[PDB]
């Protein structure tokens, strides 16, 4: 009981030695609430005042027998030691031991350690430490020695059982202190790096961090199977890309204009440097890489006079290659993370042909889309079950816990403040303020600036008046009692500080919008999430901040001097690049960018200056650990808040009274106005009704729509030359229109006007036939070349939409997407206003500053030393012709352009040139300077954290809640599966969960008996598995440029492997006696061995009978079938692959709809952008001139990769960039682009594709939760 409090005495020590004597004469877990480091049970009451900081005997009966004693704080936390003297000298009663306990057992000691640690972290971030910091370093070493020595004196070193080194966290202290004195007593980067380990001590000293890091480790522990699958899949696809693309990125066009007997070999002998490479090969302007080339008809066709020859290095400094298995693995990992993969995709297609788009499609679907889903689902399950355990433990803990003139003036003015009118007036003024500050733009006249300024003066007037009036209406002591009032006070007093006599300060007016949270339910949820970011979940956010700090400082210490000294090898003018790790801030930015998803481009430079190894380990550590922590935080916010939600408001009072008033006047004026004052037709009906419902009509009509939609794809820029096909297409178009008109008439007659017109699908078909009629009559009358009718032409691209109602897959998927529109619209409004705040802030900061004065020959901004003003560039234009004062196309000149720039930043596409213009901006009409505004990166960091991370978190939560609501409103069935797919899906459930088959019969024949016993055993299976892994290795051994001897060797080893696997299959045939074919995996074995032999014969036929290397490489892929068999044994890999097989139907439906959307946008893009100028992505190979070339671009940007590069040439609309009078083969003129259609096209596309792929994400992840 509570009485069990007694001092630790030497008499008690005698008692201890004697009862341990008893236990030794004759010769239980520790309590879950009595272990050290937490709070003592409340049943024992409070401590005697003479007992704090004094040794006590252990309360646990299990620990009452061994050597131990407990010590308490004033904070009443418990620490336990062992009774054995420290190192066998310091008895627990010496002066040293209890002074060490007193110092160690204290809150002030821990606080001192925390402050000195954080000061040390502040001192780590010094690029060039001043010489005087040595003494400060010695000081820190002194405090760390003091704290260590206190721990040894209080606990011993290792002699006992509970002592200094027993817990792992003290090992870090020991290592750092011994390494500090090692460097003190005795590759400066190597020594200076290991001091970052003290930054890890915050995890030990700040409370709660221990459990957070333990939780992260436990979450990792579950990723074993998924990491094995990831390695397996990346290796298999790396071998596939090895076989297909080995050496193609070596192709370069070579100038045939070489004279004086210099042939290809005569130059081969002398190609070692890069200057001679630039002398003889083709380098597109502004590129460090030689332009690729190919041999197929669909590859990169070299210019005239250039021959395409595979010589020289691979692109990107050598690092983009599918030559050796390591480089292929790097490429497939860059494809799985979709990091700048839209450049590898373009190079691979340019050098190998547009026909490996299928390779990239299957890699993107399987590599990126699926493995990431698996990772997210497993981490989510880990966190969810851990959270359930925590909640259940907390609940159990709760159950155990339970078991004169001024006064009348003030009250009258307070009455002037009534909830209905004052609050709504203030809300309206807030909304008008935000809509009034949104009228700022760069080209502005004094009139409009003046009205803006006076309006802002008025609004700050009303808000200050409100603040003073609520100051005096209710006592200032009580004004501050609520958070909203103090928030508003801070806003007002800061706006007055503005009115005293800064650009960032101009915009904190915008925060008063958030006061709308009380009325608006969904904005309040964003407030809740941002609050959890620092509230219930502040420890995890603090872990994340600490890790980003440590990675930044580690990378800086390792690579700063490397970046500085080897600067000339990553930049041509021999100055530091834009992204570097020379400073703490720039290394922080690189770490942040890697956390955003951008890691290949900076690692190329890292490895250029600091060598491959360290760069790879450090970058992959950052990737894995940082992405782990960020994903954990995101999932925690999501689950916590959307399971959290799982006096009347002042606006509600206003609605009440205003409804009272409006209803009162409405019905009283209502009272005022009352007081002041045929068998044949229905035969046709039935016959048509069975006609339209008859199956052949439906199938014919679906075929008809498919044919019209397909005919849409031929009208490309080569339809003039195809004389025959043109006539067929136009005649067919007429027939299609007539058929659909007849279909509409038949359905009209058969169903009736109301029935046909109460259905939305018929509304779609009706609008389409209407526009076809319009264009038909306009063609007949002769007004074909009128512009509006020429535009109604392009609307023929909407024809594929007729298919949505005929196939049930996109019908059900569209039903779900439509059921989700309201919630999507609420979230979109919240995001719209949030990004509106950020867009007005960006317009205040940057509007009109992105202008610059350039050499148009190379695009080089002039030095700001000369030509620093706009007038200076105009003078230069006057004196030198080819000079331009150009602005960025996507900029912050107004709130629309601000929202386009924010959309580019939030998806990290095009965002870099935006930030370079931001940080280099000086002021309006002044030329930008290199990182003049260096700390404007923080605007983008804050926008990415808030408008991107948190809004996406809110969107995901609302979508998940909406989809589970739909699933419950359907009774618990699936929402992307038709009836037949549900039936199949249940069937494949039954197949997968099959009870094991009965044991195979035992053959009677004796030699059959021996072979059967041999083959049917574990050892045979393990032997085959080891052989398959060995064959995998001998496949990875292949490289590019290998000598013929190694080729023959690997050929023979592969032959041997085919021999042994054929032997295994033959012994299986003989021993199981056609029962081989019963078990499913043996059919796969059979197919693998057959295709292995057939491919091995066919290839050797190819190099001797029909010599074509491409077909050779395609058939030689049958080797890869052998590798597939490793999934035979792994019980987790199968489960995951069976999850994929389970989820395939829903993905088929969603991908069908996505494909139809891509088809529609491809027809539109061919109609509109087929003649835009070739700039920044639109080139000879990647354009909208053909259906293939359009759908290639649309697949590229279905992942939103590089859409900023396709949109850029369309934004050209004027003669300085584009050219509006240029003869074209369509009959039109100009290679120009109109921005409005381009912006609508790309923004819409990325939004619809985002919605659809998020739907795929939800389907797959819920499938994984269901199966597991
Ligand atoms: C928590 C812990 C996180 C993980 C930490 C460790 C993770 C990965 C560490 C991998 C370390 C690999 C070290 C390779 C050392 C090396 O230097 O090896 C040399 C080879 C061959 O060099 P070369 O002859 O081509 O020189 C080319 C010259 N040039 C290209 C300029 C023309 O270079 C190469 O193969 C480069 C091979 C890189 C292959 C991709 C590595 C795996 C990537 C992701 C795995 C998942 C994470
Ligand atoms: C149904 C659901 C809809 C959801 C989205 C609604 C968004 C609503 C926001 C804005 C729409 C209206 C904006 C105002 C439009 C009129 C602007 C105007 O009158 O003209 C001024 C500027 C052009 O300036 P200029 O002619 O002097 O320069 C000449 C440039 N030269 C050389 C190319 C000719 O006009 C411009 O270009 C403005 C160009 C940008 C237009 C807005 C961009 C929208 C992008 C993203 C919005 C969605 C974000 C994503 C949210 C979900 C994730
Ligand atoms: C580059 C590589 C190019 C070379 C690749 C070569 C091989 C590619 C395709 C060959 C496929 C050969 C046939 C594959 C399916 C074999 C089969 O017959 O599959 C049967 C199963 C259902 O039978 P069961 O396993 O329940 O039989 C009862 C036995 N019990 C219940 C105890 C497990 O159907 C299923 O799962 C179907 C699952 C099919 C997945 C095919 C993926 C191939 C990639
Ligand atoms: O329900 C739709 C109704 C009833 O079905 P139905 O079309 O007669 O079915 C015909 C088919 N051969 C069959 O019986 O299997 O379809 C009808 O036959 C009702 C009228 C359809 C349109 C006829 C023209 C009148 C205009 C619509 C008037 C509807 C009422 C609108 C005013 C209502 C005011 C209260
Ligand atoms: C407390 O008990 C709750 C239980 C119901 C549990 O339902 C779960 C269904 C799976 C689901 C929706 C849940 C939590 C984490 C969710 C994952 C977090 C990741 O977030 C994402 C999207 C957002 C990205 C930023 C990160 O990845 C998804 C890929 C991943 C995710 C959305 C896949 C789906 C997961 C809730 C009922 O108990 C009675
Ligand atoms: C739902 C919320 C988040 C947005 C509501 C729409 C408006 C409040 C915003 C969005 C687009 C903004 C407009 C973007 C473009 C312009 C053009 C601008 O005038 C010019 O650029 C003239 C240029 C010239 O004369 O050369 C004036 C501000 C204005 C109207 C902005 C006013 C504020 C607008 C209309
Ligand atoms: C904030 C600045 C940039 C002006 C932007 C426009 C807003 C004033 C509009 C857009 C969204 C509208 C809100 C949409 C949703 C709501 C919630 C509505 O109340 C509920 O929905 C209660 C639901 C429930 O209790 O379950 C009150 C109106 C309100 C705040 C609307 C108020 C007017 C809003 C905020
Ligand atoms: C010709 C161009 C210039 C303008 C075209 C405008 C139409 C696209 C608008 C006007 C009437 C609207 C329709 C009004 C009625 C309906 C029925 C509605 O379905 C129902 O109401 C079902 C009700 C039920 O089942 O109980 C679906 C939307 C729809 C097709 C609307 C779709 C959009 C329509 C066709
Ligand atoms: C599955 C259907 C889902 C709905 C999809 C909409 C209808 C889908 C109808 O598909 C037809 C397209 O495949 C036609 O494309 P083509 O390859 O014929 O065009 C190339 C012509 N050139 C390039 C030779 C000139
Ligand atoms: C330039 C102009 C661009 C215009 C683009 C227009 C795109 C429009 C897309 C509309 C996309 C089609 O609209 C979907 C609605 O028809 C949904 O239909 P319902 O769910 O009401 O029908 C019931 C079906 N069940 C419930 C029986 C299964
Ligand atoms: C790419 C690889 C794709 C692999 C796809 C494999 C699909 C594998 C689909 O398996 C289908 C079986 O389960 C059907 O078995 P039953 O005939 O018993 O079920 C009948 C159900 N009906 C008749 C009612 C519909
Ligand atoms: C970011 C991720 C973007 C992904 C873009 C590419 C996605 C590509 C998504 O397409 C996946 C579907 O085509 C797979 O379905 P199957 O081809 O197996 O069709 C058979 C389905 N049954 C046979 C079971 C019905
Ligand atoms: C989910 C859907 C994912 C994308 C699906 C796209 C399917 C496939 C439709 O995309 C068209 C691509 O195949 C174009 O590549 P081609 O092989 O046609 O290019 C060669 C053309 N010439 C130069 C030989 C004539
Ligand atoms: C803009 O750049 C171009 C090319 O970079 C300059 O034109 C020539 O540049 C070369 C450098 O390789 C000089 O040797 C020539 O003398 C330049 N020719 C002329 C006519 O200038 C051009 O000078 C640059 N513009 C300005 C204003 O300096
Ligand atoms: C912007 O242009 C120049 C760029 O330095 C500014 O400086 C003037 O330059 C002219 C021509 O070199 C000199 O004659 C003047 O003496 C410079 N000004 C001064 C104060 O020395 C010029 O002032 C700027 N003009 C505007 C309108 O901003
Ligand atoms: C008619 C329906 C309109 C729907 C509009 C879309 C609503 C979106 C609301 C949430 C906004 C999320 C903003 C986040 C940006 C992402 O694109 C990023 C994605 O970056 P990631 O690929 O996750 O690194
Ligand atoms: C071949 O190259 C040599 C250079 O040593 C040159 O003298 C000779 O004329 C060349 N032959 C022809 C046919 O151009
Ligand atoms: Na990159």
Coordinates of C-alpha atoms in Angstrom, one line a residue, residues 650-937:
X650 CA -23.7 33.5 -34.9
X651 CA -24.3 33.1 -38.6
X652 CA -27.1 30.7 -37.6
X653 CA -28.6 33.4 -35.4
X654 CA -28.4 35.8 -38.3
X655 CA -30.1 33.2 -40.6
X656 CA -32.8 32.8 -38.1
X657 CA -33.7 36.5 -37.8
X658 CA -33.3 37.2 -41.5
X659 CA -35.5 34.2 -42.2
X660 CA -38.0 35.6 -39.7
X661 CA -38.0 39.0 -41.4
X662 CA -38.1 37.8 -45.0
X663 CA -40.7 35.1 -44.3
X664 CA -42.8 37.6 -42.2
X665 CA -42.8 40.2 -45.0
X666 CA -43.2 37.5 -47.7
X667 CA -46.4 36.0 -46.2
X668 CA -47.8 39.3 -45.1
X669 CA -47.4 40.6 -48.7
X670 CA -48.9 37.3 -49.8
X671 CA -51.9 38.1 -47.6
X672 CA -51.8 41.6 -49.0
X673 CA -52.1 40.4 -52.6
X674 CA -54.9 37.9 -51.6
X675 CA -56.8 40.7 -49.9
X676 CA -56.3 43.2 -52.7
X677 CA -57.9 40.8 -55.2
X678 CA -55.3 6.2 -83.4
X679 CA -54.5 2.5 -83.1
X680 CA -52.0 2.6 -86.0
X681 CA -49.8 5.1 -84.3
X682 CA -49.6 3.0 -81.1
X683 CA -48.9 0.0 -83.4
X684 CA -45.9 1.9 -84.7
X685 CA -45.2 2.6 -81.0
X686 CA -44.9 -1.0 -80.0
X687 CA -43.1 -2.1 -83.1
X688 CA -40.5 0.7 -82.7
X689 CA -40.2 -0.1 -79.0
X690 CA -39.2 -3.7 -79.6
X691 CA -37.0 -2.5 -82.5
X692 CA -34.8 -0.3 -80.2
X693 CA -34.7 -2.8 -77.4
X694 CA -33.8 -5.6 -79.8
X695 CA -30.2 -6.8 -79.3
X696 CA -29.1 -6.5 -82.9
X697 CA -29.9 -2.8 -83.0
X698 CA -27.9 -2.1 -79.8
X699 CA -24.9 -4.1 -81.1
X700 CA -25.0 -2.4 -84.5
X701 CA -25.2 1.1 -82.9
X702 CA -22.2 0.3 -80.6
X703 CA -20.3 -0.8 -83.6
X704 CA -21.4 2.4 -85.4
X705 CA -20.0 4.6 -82.5
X706 CA -16.8 2.7 -82.4
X707 CA -16.4 3.2 -86.2
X708 CA -17.1 6.9 -86.1
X709 CA -14.7 7.4 -83.1
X710 CA -12.0 5.5 -84.9
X711 CA -12.5 7.4 -88.1
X712 CA -11.9 10.5 -86.0
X713 CA -8.2 9.4 -85.7
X714 CA -7.3 9.6 -89.4
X715 CA -7.8 13.3 -89.9
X716 CA -4.2 14.2 -89.3
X717 CA -1.9 16.6 -91.1
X718 CA -1.3 14.0 -93.9
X719 CA -4.9 13.7 -95.0
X720 CA -4.3 15.9 -98.1
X721 CA -1.9 13.5 -99.5
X722 CA -4.1 10.5 -98.8
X723 CA -6.6 11.3 -101.6
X724 CA -8.4 8.0 -101.5
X725 CA -9.0 7.9 -97.7
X726 CA -10.3 11.5 -97.5
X727 CA -13.3 10.8 -99.7
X728 CA -14.2 7.6 -97.8
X729 CA -13.9 9.5 -94.5
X730 CA -16.2 12.4 -95.4
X731 CA -18.8 10.1 -97.1
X732 CA -18.7 7.9 -94.0
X733 CA -19.1 11.0 -91.8
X734 CA -22.3 11.8 -93.6
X735 CA -23.6 8.3 -93.2
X736 CA -22.8 8.4 -89.5
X737 CA -24.8 11.6 -89.0
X738 CA -27.7 10.1 -90.8
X739 CA -27.6 6.9 -88.8
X740 CA -27.5 8.7 -85.5
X741 CA -30.4 11.0 -86.6
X742 CA -32.5 7.9 -87.5
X743 CA -31.5 6.4 -84.1
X744 CA -32.7 9.5 -82.3
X745 CA -36.0 9.5 -84.2
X746 CA -36.6 5.8 -83.5
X747 CA -36.0 6.2 -79.8
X748 CA -38.2 9.3 -79.7
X749 CA -41.0 7.4 -81.3
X750 CA -40.5 4.3 -79.3
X751 CA -40.1 5.7 -75.8
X752 CA -41.8 9.1 -75.9
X753 CA -40.6 12.6 -75.3
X754 CA -40.8 12.6 -71.6
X755 CA -39.0 9.3 -71.2
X756 CA -36.3 10.3 -73.7
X757 CA -35.9 13.7 -72.1
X758 CA -35.9 12.6 -68.4
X759 CA -32.7 10.6 -69.0
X760 CA -29.3 12.3 -69.1
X761 CA -27.6 9.8 -71.4
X762 CA -30.1 10.7 -74.1
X763 CA -29.4 14.3 -73.3
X764 CA -25.7 13.6 -74.2
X765 CA -26.7 11.9 -77.4
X766 CA -29.2 14.6 -78.2
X767 CA -26.6 17.4 -77.9
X768 CA -24.2 15.5 -80.1
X769 CA -26.7 15.0 -82.8
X770 CA -27.7 18.6 -82.5
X771 CA -24.2 19.9 -83.1
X772 CA -23.9 17.5 -86.1
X773 CA -27.1 18.9 -87.5
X774 CA -25.8 22.4 -87.1
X775 CA -22.6 21.7 -88.9
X776 CA -24.4 19.7 -91.6
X777 CA -26.9 22.4 -92.5
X778 CA -24.1 25.0 -92.3
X779 CA -22.1 23.0 -94.8
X780 CA -25.1 22.6 -97.1
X781 CA -26.0 26.3 -97.1
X782 CA -22.4 27.1 -97.8
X783 CA -21.2 28.9 -94.6
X784 CA -18.4 26.4 -94.1
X785 CA -15.6 28.9 -93.7
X786 CA -17.4 31.1 -91.1
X787 CA -15.3 31.0 -88.0
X788 CA -18.0 29.9 -85.5
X789 CA -19.0 27.0 -87.7
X790 CA -15.3 26.2 -88.2
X791 CA -15.2 26.0 -84.4
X792 CA -18.3 23.8 -84.1
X793 CA -16.3 21.5 -86.4
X794 CA -13.8 20.8 -83.7
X795 CA -16.6 19.7 -81.4
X796 CA -16.7 16.5 -83.4
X797 CA -14.0 15.3 -81.1
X798 CA -16.7 14.8 -78.4
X799 CA -18.2 11.8 -80.3
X800 CA -16.4 9.1 -78.2
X801 CA -18.6 10.2 -75.3
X802 CA -21.4 8.2 -76.8
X803 CA -19.6 5.1 -75.7
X804 CA -19.9 5.9 -72.0
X805 CA -23.5 4.7 -71.8
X806 CA -23.0 1.5 -73.8
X807 CA -20.3 -0.3 -71.8
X808 CA -21.1 -0.9 -68.2
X809 CA -17.5 -0.5 -67.0
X810 CA -17.3 3.2 -67.6
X811 CA -21.0 3.5 -66.7
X812 CA -20.4 2.3 -63.1
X813 CA -17.1 4.3 -62.9
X814 CA -18.9 7.4 -64.0
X815 CA -21.6 6.7 -61.5
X816 CA -19.1 6.7 -58.7
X817 CA -17.3 9.8 -60.0
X818 CA -20.6 11.6 -60.2
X819 CA -21.6 10.5 -56.7
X820 CA -18.4 12.1 -55.6
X821 CA -18.8 15.5 -57.1
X822 CA -20.3 17.5 -54.2
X823 CA -17.5 16.6 -51.7
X824 CA -14.9 17.3 -54.4
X825 CA -16.4 20.7 -55.0
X826 CA -16.3 21.6 -51.3
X827 CA -12.7 20.6 -51.1
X828 CA -12.0 22.4 -54.3
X829 CA -13.5 25.6 -53.0
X830 CA -11.4 25.4 -49.8
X831 CA -8.3 24.9 -52.0
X832 CA -9.3 27.7 -54.3
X833 CA -9.5 30.3 -51.5
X834 CA -6.3 28.9 -49.8
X835 CA -4.4 29.1 -53.1
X836 CA -6.0 32.5 -53.6
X837 CA -4.4 33.8 -50.4
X838 CA -1.1 32.4 -51.6
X839 CA -1.7 33.9 -55.1
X840 CA -2.3 37.4 -53.8
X841 CA 0.8 37.0 -51.6
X842 CA 2.8 36.0 -54.7
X843 CA 1.4 39.0 -56.7
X844 CA 2.4 41.3 -53.9
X845 CA 5.9 39.8 -53.8
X846 CA 6.8 39.2 -57.4
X847 CA 4.3 40.9 -59.8
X848 CA 6.1 42.6 -62.7
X849 CA 9.6 41.5 -61.5
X850 CA 10.2 38.5 -63.8
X851 CA 11.1 40.7 -66.8
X852 CA 14.7 40.3 -68.0
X853 CA 17.0 41.5 -70.8
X854 CA 18.5 38.7 -72.8
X855 CA 20.7 37.6 -75.6
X856 CA 18.1 35.8 -77.7
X857 CA 20.9 33.8 -79.5
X858 CA 21.6 31.6 -76.5
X859 CA 19.1 32.8 -73.9
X860 CA 21.8 34.2 -71.6
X861 CA 20.6 36.9 -69.2
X862 CA 22.9 39.9 -69.4
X863 CA 25.0 40.8 -66.3
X864 CA 23.3 43.2 -64.1
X865 CA 26.4 45.3 -63.9
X866 CA 25.7 46.6 -67.3
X867 CA 22.1 47.0 -68.6
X868 CA 20.4 47.0 -65.1
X869 CA 17.2 48.9 -66.0
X870 CA 14.5 48.5 -68.7
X871 CA 15.6 51.7 -70.4
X872 CA 19.1 50.2 -70.6
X873 CA 17.8 47.1 -72.4
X874 CA 15.8 49.3 -74.8
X875 CA 19.0 51.3 -75.5
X876 CA 20.9 48.0 -76.1
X877 CA 18.1 47.0 -78.5
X878 CA 18.6 50.2 -80.4
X879 CA 22.4 49.8 -80.6
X880 CA 22.4 46.0 -81.0
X881 CA 19.6 44.3 -82.9
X882 CA 19.1 40.8 -81.4
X883 CA 18.4 41.7 -77.8
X884 CA 15.0 41.3 -76.0
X885 CA 13.4 42.4 -72.8
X886 CA 11.3 39.2 -72.2
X887 CA 9.0 38.1 -69.4
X888 CA 8.2 34.7 -68.2
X889 CA 5.1 33.1 -69.7
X890 CA 3.9 31.7 -66.4
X891 CA 4.4 34.4 -63.8
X892 CA 2.8 36.3 -61.0
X893 CA 1.5 39.3 -62.9
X894 CA -2.1 38.8 -61.8
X895 CA -4.2 36.3 -59.8
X896 CA -5.0 34.1 -62.7
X897 CA -1.4 33.8 -63.7
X898 CA -0.7 33.4 -60.0
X899 CA -2.9 30.3 -59.9
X900 CA -1.3 28.9 -62.9
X901 CA 2.1 29.4 -61.3
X902 CA 0.9 27.8 -58.1
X903 CA -0.4 24.9 -60.1
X904 CA 3.0 24.5 -61.7
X905 CA 4.7 24.7 -58.3
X906 CA 2.3 22.3 -56.5
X907 CA 2.9 19.6 -59.0
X908 CA 6.7 20.4 -59.2
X909 CA 6.5 20.8 -63.0
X910 CA 8.0 24.0 -64.4
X911 CA 8.5 25.1 -60.8
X912 CA 12.3 25.6 -61.0
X913 CA 12.4 28.5 -63.5
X914 CA 9.6 30.1 -61.5
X915 CA 11.7 30.0 -58.4
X916 CA 14.9 31.1 -60.2
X917 CA 13.0 34.2 -61.4
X918 CA 11.5 34.7 -57.9
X919 CA 14.9 34.5 -56.1
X920 CA 16.7 36.6 -58.6
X921 CA 14.1 39.3 -58.7
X922 CA 15.2 42.8 -57.6
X923 CA 12.3 45.2 -58.4
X924 CA 10.0 46.4 -61.2
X925 CA 11.8 47.7 -64.3
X926 CA 15.1 46.5 -62.8
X927 CA 17.1 43.6 -64.2
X928 CA 17.3 40.5 -62.0
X929 CA 20.4 39.7 -60.1
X930 CA 21.8 36.3 -59.1
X931 CA 20.0 35.3 -55.9
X932 CA 19.3 38.8 -54.9
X933 CA 16.1 37.6 -53.2
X934 CA 17.8 34.4 -52.0
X935 CA 15.3 33.8 -49.2
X936 CA 12.2 33.8 -51.4
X937 CA 12.6 30.1 -51.5

